[PDB]
Write a structure and sequence with these properties.
InterPro entries (chains B, C, D): ENaC (IPR001873)
Distance between the termini of chain A: 10 Å
Shape of chain A: rod-shaped
Bound molecules: a molecule of 2 linked components (NAG-NAG), 2-acetamido-2-deoxy-beta-D-glucopyranose
Largest interface: B-C, 73 and 75 residues
Keywords (chains B, C, D): Calcium, Ion channel, Ion transport, Membrane, Metal-binding, Sodium, Sodium channel, Sodium transport, Transmembrane, Transmembrane helix, Transport
CATH topology of one domain in chain B: Acid-sensing ion channels like fold
Organism (chains B, C, D): Aplysia californica
Number of helices of chain B: 14
Oligomer: heterohexamer
Pfam families (chains B, C, D): ASC
CATH superfamily of one domain in chain B: Acid-sensing ion channels like domains
Number of strands of chain A: 1
Radius of gyration of chain A: 4 Å
Main location (chains B, C, D): membrane
Shape of chain B: flat
Strand content of chain A: over 45%
Number of strands of chain B: 22
CATH class of one domain in chain B: Mainly Beta
């Protein structure tokens, strides 16, 4: 639910 | 001459008995009528208020976890959901899938009421986090219910206005993310990725529906929700089929038709496919788990044997079956009569009028922050309230007119506070409850009042006809 | 054979007369029913609109007073309210206590409609401050009523939409405080310390309740309040007990149940304790003063004789008694039947739908500010509109694309304007008034229609029984 | 003894027949009563949603036109409207006059749904600009209607909540103006000069009234409009006079009383003066043009012969006549009975509850902007989304804690996005339709039930009286 | 509707 | 109602  | 007498008597008897049959038929169809009246003397039951954070996860706890070494599961989970291909890729690029496939970490990441609710005041008396019952909702992870009907019996308003009502200074804890991290916008989700508080003002003792029935509220504004109480009382058998029952769910809820529909949808989903949806109310039925749970996702990510190629599709059969059944239920209301269920004989609803205002004034921001610290925050120097309070305290204690820098400090403090803080008043505008009572359209007393005058004489004339006929 | 005749006649007579008695009993209980109908032809009475500034005091007048030497009382009052200990310390660290213990200075500090209302337009015709009647309300010091029923008889809407309705460009006059000064956040106050305008859309000729019945509106947004008119007409004796009376208060108000309850609460408070509350409507009864008035507070602060130790408690008996009586009244509705009072036979309410939008566009901000100056501001170079207008005018007259600085100037002008200015439209969405009329459930004409057919024959048969009985 | 018999029979007959006459008279006045009932099983028809941009013109297209050489007309028009004196100077310093006196350029300047609607999602299924029918409205130039009743038959909600409903990510395209250009604030206009989207949630197949019936919505906030469906069914002849007709206007609209009033106002305006108003619904009647059209304004501006002095008054007779007739119609409702028209026998309205929240979170802004580009924007490097996406992408890919600059970049991206973008959810809170059905107060079956018992015997006794009288 |  |  969250990338870098 | 008696022939005319007999003929006119017969005609009159047929007319009168057809009229009586029409009346008793009108009574046989047990019609009802809703009568609305404004009762200004009945005591008003203060609603149940469920506050949820629109952002389920907290970036602060996430950052703390990465600084420590207990985020591995999350670090694995992301590494898993972003390496393999999955159908409904938007679902498992979301936070609900993160909750479903590893619940404990989702709880550890979700918001806490302590950190969320910064000041509470009900009926001019201070209230704490001990007046809110916690509960869980996927995509609205932690939802806290004031006047939930469990800690105390029920709450009543004997006074109107925002002074005699719930007042919540809530910090949405909108914390800046990790230096090189951005969230994934789930475009199949019409309610998330927003800053604010999702408030459900629902009947006391009834399960909250933060998605369907909640209304959202923005940070940096004091939003006042004035409530007008509507009491809809229905008729039981034989006029109707309402019952004064209680829904089961996780915990005994006061019956509402929509909540029962959601529960029977969840039960139908549990029956059709052997999984459960986090969108619907939880049921906790062994050994049913959440739909969209990949049971061996840790084993799949741990590429111990190389049968899992990069970007390979992962089946997720249960998720697809849940999507199919949910689509069929959402696009067809015929299920509503299968699980049946009934409207609560007595239901309480509220017309809410929400009006917001810019809060807090820059004048009172320092005096606010001082008390919020003095009551709730002994730690976390790397916090918005602390950085904002530093600015405001150096403004108020310099040791004329604000300098550009002074103005910059005041503005930065105001932006921090109004990005994170919001006041929410929930109150009864008036104690006049609008009661819609279902009444028998043709009461039995009305039937007697409309038949007896005829019937008393005409049974006697029927006896006369008998005596004249066969004797 | 006449025995059967007599018996059946007696049975029929008893049945018919019991039916008639049941009907006349149903009429004896003067029931009423509320019938709702949408009248699309009756003229709609435009409401009374009371605008209040959510921030009662004005920091500009405060700063002006300190620059001069007429603020001494205030400088004394603060110096007094902080040096000594007082019960309900939050009350007399607030602005309501400042009003109560020295009223004239509170008036001199409160907002003026000139400075507050910057542009008014009703029914496509320009309106000025001469259409608003001033009034006072503690914690909402100055409250100005358009269509208050005093200057003109009444106002009517013959046209819907925000074009044919009240439009108010209002500057909340949110001015930056003194360089080293911060306000005290009264945490026992759920409505203040916010920027915006408190609007009460109430029945024409009825006293406004800015606290209980108002809804707040934020600066920097054009907020449109669309109104749907509800006309509730009640029945007088014998069906009900409403009267077409008028409340007294300070000035003759059209009767509303809530306003009368507030007035009788104020009267009960005046009787039980010999003081008066600024929260409730004013009454101006000699020699009753406000509760929470320390009569010799100037003498106490002036430590002429040292019997007043530092941080010493100050009794404030009247304030405690007012708090006790207010708590008892707010937590118990039994008083509502003592002062009695009645619902207005004819009452007008409004369903308001408030929708806000970002106002004004940066495109039109300069053209706005030009007219606001050209009409209202000849002085005060140290004003937000002036600093904002300087930025916008240097943008529009440099003497491509906006430069970073140009962009910074535009942004700073927009923040100033939208921190201080707001548009408020109040209008009727539709001219169809929803009328709830109370009607006799069993009208006398209905009684006659339901008894006469029986009664005409059965009084005659009673005469027959008389003649057959004793002659 | 028969004298008493005759007298009592006559008295009873007169009483009974007067009662019957009273009943048939009560039926003769065809009274109606509105009965409200909550139907929880009838299918709910999803409304028609008309979104308009509160700013009619787009500064981007305007700037593009000046960079090219096709803006001459506009450059002429401004040069004309600002050189000659005109009555109602505020009208032709506005944008409506720009539309009226040169329509094609106004269309070329107005907003396009492509640029306006950035993401649409209805009933969990993606929707595009192909689901919105365009239409035109002066001062709200382009208005796009979802579920307009033309592309598809009708749309139905079988599911509640914001998930199963319309979701629109809309960019208001608020673009910074030309370097030395500022718009003119039309102070006779209570709705324009605001940033946001004007939303009309109206009955399906009924013409939208963006001015009168719309509610505005601000950028930078996800605003959720929960709808409760009200179905008002009326009675045709003889009880009422409603008809199931359809309005004509430009295109066949489902009949609503207000829309028909607007159309008959437009027709009355077309008759009284030979022009037409852009405020009212368009009619397209040859050879009628818009009121406030100066037919030779191009010739007047082109000072080919010097009879047009600087700052000279220009007549504009049609505009003055339109203002006169509009004032007379707005200040007097007597016209409502001339053009007559009738309420729709079946009408659908909605109680809307609008609740806004801060959107989007700074966490999800980059992931948003990525998809908005990937779907909609291949060009225009000089765009807000592009400048915002540059900031966010350099934050997320630097190649701890945010630096001041990093913080400045994040803040500038958030301000751009939240100045331009907004999410709008429109959904049904509940599928229980509140139906107000008009019913005969005294039904014919009720008349028969209330007369037959008497009538059957008393026609026979009338025959008895005949036989005893003349034979 | 817009000046310079 | 306001400190320094
Ligand atoms: C998911 O985790 C795997 C580790 O199991 C990552 O693969 C590593 O990537 C780095 C970066 O180039 C290499 O140096 C390692 O040799 C890789 N390990 C392998 C292939 O076993 C992978 O990049 C991660 N992916 C995501 C999206 O986070
Ligand atoms: C909020 O919670 C507090 C603490 O649970 C409640 O205070 C208690 O109230 C009960 C009666 O309801 C008393 O018997 C206890 O002595 C109280 N304890 C304390 C520490 O105050 C309070 O009533 C709750 N208020 C609401 C509105 O729910
Ligand atoms: C899982 O592991 C297998 C083998 O350990 C990987 O297959 C190799 O992947 C590399 C790329 O890193 C290729 O160069 C090789 O040709 C592949 N085959 C072999 C026999 O080494 C596979 O890519 C891994 N998959 C994931 C998702 O980690
Ligand atoms: C309870 O009573 C209601 C009465 O409204 C029933 O609702 C009807 O159910 C039938 C079943 O086929 C539908 O066809 C009707 O449209 C419903 N509404 C009506 C008649 O107004 C309901 O079925 C009853 N039972 C339950 C379990 O709710
Ligand atoms: C309230 O006013 C008194 C003055 O009557 C202040 O007392 C003075 O404080 C200054 C600052 O140290 C001293 O130099 C004076 O000698 C004091 N005068 C006295 C004690 O008579 C007091 O500080 C003020 N307090 C507040 C909270 O404003
Ligand atoms: C607003 O106030 C103005 C001035 O008090 C009103 O204008 C007056 O209206 C009366 C009739 O109501 C006339 O007799 C006067 O000649 C008018 N005077 C001026 C200077 O215009 C106006 O009617 C008020 N409007 C509203 C809506 O209250
Ligand atoms: C009121 O005045 C008395 C005396 O004028 C003050 O009492 C003295 O306070 C000082 C502190 O400033 C002490 O050092 C003395 O010991 C006190 N006693 C005497 C006899 O001087 C008293 O503090 C004053 N109180 C206030 C609120 O101003
Ligand atoms: C006016 O009539 C109303 C009728 O509703 C009276 O209201 C009732 O008052 C009694 C007094 O004890 C209460 O017990 C009831 O609960 C009230 N409501 C009812 C009966 O619906 C009211 O008392 C009358 N008098 C006044 C002064 O309002
Ligand atoms: C409208 O356009 C006319 C051109 O027809 C402008 O008049 C010109 O103004 C410039 C600037 O001083 C002069 O150099 C020209 O000689 C003028 N031309 C004439 C008078 O024919 C006029 O200024 C424009 N006005 C506006 C408000 O745009
Ligand atoms: C939105 O518009 C699309 C395209 O016009 C609609 O999709 C079509 O729907 C019809 C039936 O309504 C089908 O026969 C077509 O095959 C569909 N075409 C495509 C390309 O999908 C869609 O139904 C509309 N949705 C709504 C809610 O109006
Ligand atoms: C239209 O043109 C006439 C003549 O071409 C203008 O009249 C002259 O205006 C100038 C000002 O620019 C004066 O100095 C002259 O005295 C005027 N008269 C003559 C005979 O030249 C007139 O001003 C123009 N009007 C507009 C609106 O452009
Ligand atoms: C349709 O029926 C309505 C019934 O309400 C008529 O409305 C009345 O019209 C008369 C005409 O002079 C008005 O005086 C009344 O005030 C109206 N309302 C009532 C009686 O409640 C209407 O005129 C009829 N015809 C049309 C074309 O609407
Ligand atoms: C679910 O699985 C568990 C495995 O431990 C089993 O014991 C249990 O019986 C199963 N549920 C049912 C209803 O059989
Ligand atoms: C992964 O596969 C999907 C379809 O199977 C494709 O759309 C996507 O581009 C692929 N991504 C990568 C990084 O190979
Ligand atoms: C209130 O006090 C004043 C003192 O001037 C006195 O004259 C008056 O009579 C008092 N009020 C009453 C009701 O006695
Ligand atoms: C004043 O006294 C109160 C209680 O009497 C105490 O709480 C407070 O801390 C004291 N303040 C000072 C400055 O002495
Ligand atoms: C309007 O003007 C045109 C001019 O081309 C003319 O042909 C037409 O007949 C006119 N309209 C009517 C109704 O006569
Ligand atoms: C134009 O004329 C009007 C009135 O005729 C006047 O108010 C205005 O000031 C004049 N403007 C110029 C630039 O002459």
């Amino acid at each position: 639910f969250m990338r870098f | 001459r008696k022939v005319i007498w007999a003929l006119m008597v017969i005609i009159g008897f047929t007319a009168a008995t057809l009229q009586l049959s029409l009346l008793v038929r009108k009574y046989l169809q047990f019609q009802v009528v809703e009568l609305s009246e404004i009762k200004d003397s009945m005591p008003v039951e203060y609603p149940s208020v469920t506050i949820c954070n629109i952002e389920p996860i907290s970036l602060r706890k996430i950052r703390k976890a990465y600084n420590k070494n207990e985020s591995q599961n999350l670090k694995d989970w992301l590494n898993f959901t972003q390496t393999f291909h999955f159908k409904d890729m938007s679902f498992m690029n979301s936070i609900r899938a993160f909750y479903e496939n590893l619940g404990s970490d989702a709880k550890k990441i979700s918001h806490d009421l302590r950190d969320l609710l910064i000041h509470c005041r009900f009926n001019r008396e201070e209230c704490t986090t001990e007046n809110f019952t916690s509960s869980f909702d996927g995509n609205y992870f932690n939802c806290f219910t004031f006047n939930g009907g469990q800690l105390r019996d029920q709450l009543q308003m004997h006074a109107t206005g925002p002074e005699n009502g719930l007042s919540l200074i809530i910090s949405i804890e909108k914390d800046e993310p990790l230096p090189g991290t951005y969230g994934v916008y789930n475009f199949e989700n019409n309610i998330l990725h927003s800053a604010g508080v999702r408030v459900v003002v629902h009947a006391p003792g009834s399960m909250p529906s933060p998605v369907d029935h909640g209304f959202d509220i923005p940070p940096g504004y004091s939003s006042s929700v004035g409530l007008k109480a509507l009491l809809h009382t229905r008729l039981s058998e034989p006029y109707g089929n309402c019952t004064e029952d209680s829904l089961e769910g996780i915990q005994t809820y006061r019956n509402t038709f929509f909540a029962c529909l959601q529960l029977c949808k969840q039960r139908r989903l549990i029956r059709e496919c052997k999984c459960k949806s986090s969108a619907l109310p939880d049921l906790s039925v062994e050994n049913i788990t959440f739909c969209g749970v990949i049971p061996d996702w840790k084993d799949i990510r741990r590429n111990v044997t190389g049968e899992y190629k990069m970007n390979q599709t992962i089946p997720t059969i249960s998720l697809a079956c849940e999507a199919r059944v949910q689509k069929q239920l959402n696009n067809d209301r015929s299920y509503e009569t299968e699980c049946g269920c009934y409207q609560p004989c007595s239901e309480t609803s509220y017309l809410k009028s929400v009006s917001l205002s810019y809060w807090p004034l820059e004048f009172y921001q320092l005096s606010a922050l001082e008390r919020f610290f003095s009551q709730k925050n002994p730690t976390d120097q790397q916090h918005f309230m602390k950085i904002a309070q530093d600015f405001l305290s150096r403004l108020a204690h310099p040791q004329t007119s604000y300098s550009l820098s002074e103005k910059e400090m005041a503005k930065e403090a105001s932006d921090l506070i109004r990005q994170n803080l919001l006041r929410l008043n929930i109150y009864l505008e008036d104690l006049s409850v609008v009661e819609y009572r279902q009444l028998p359209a043709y009461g039995l007393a009305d039937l007697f009042a409309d038949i007896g005058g005829t019937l008393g004489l005409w049974m006697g004339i029927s006896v006369l006809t008998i005596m004249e006929l066969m004797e």
